[PDB]
């Protein structure tokens, strides 16, 4: 279960990183990257990830489907959103709210999908 394998992963993971009085986590689908039960991207039954698109532009969104749970290959679904800065932040918002899909992660997903758009504009 989630709380069970979290009580195993909370301190002896391999993504856990502990230096300078901070403790982040390098899980694939951990958004805010911080080591917590709520934001861990491997423990839960339904997670959310917001990575940058493989090319220059766009933001990929990685939902974890329910049916396939012990099948890592066919477990995650991915959708590249290469749109303006606002429609993508209303699509992630709908993807999470209207689906009622892990709804406490929405503002985290928008805050990350904005960091990506900001880190993909032309620098100054």
């Amino acid at each position: 279960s989630a709380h069970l394998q979290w009580m195993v992963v909370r301190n002896c993971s391999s993504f856990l990183i502990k230096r300078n009085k901070q403790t982040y986590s390098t899980e694939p689908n951990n958004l805010k990257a911080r080591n917590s039960f709520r934001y861990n991207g491997l423990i839960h039954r339904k997670t959310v990830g917001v990575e940058p698109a493989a090319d220059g532009k766009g933001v990929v969104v990685v939902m974890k489907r329910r049916s396939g749970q012990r099948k890592p290959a066919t477990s995650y679904v991915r959708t590249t959103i290469n749109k303006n800065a606002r429609a993508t932040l209303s699509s992630i918002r709908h993807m999470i709210r209207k689906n009622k899909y892990h709804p406490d992660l929405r503002m985290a997903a928008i805050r990350r999908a904005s960091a990506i758009l900001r880190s993909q504009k032309p620098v100054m």
Binding site: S1, A2, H3, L4
Partner: protein, 53 residues
């Protein structure tokens, strides 16, 4: 847990100290949610003491 080990002499898998290890589903379950006092989620920080005189 019902059929013993055949290749070992007498061994059965260790029993479980708790079965439903998902205390999220346990905690937001109508069985338990009804038997709780309302949450006291207001923060009452120290009130500065002015002088009634």
């Amino acid at each position: 847990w019902r059929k013993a080990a055949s290749l070992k002499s007498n061994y059965n898998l260790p029993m479980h100290k708790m079965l439903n290890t998902d205390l999220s589903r346990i905690l937001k379950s109508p069985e338990i949610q009804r038997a709780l006092r309302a949450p006291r989620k207001k923060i009452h920080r120290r009130v500065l003491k002015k002088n009634p005189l």
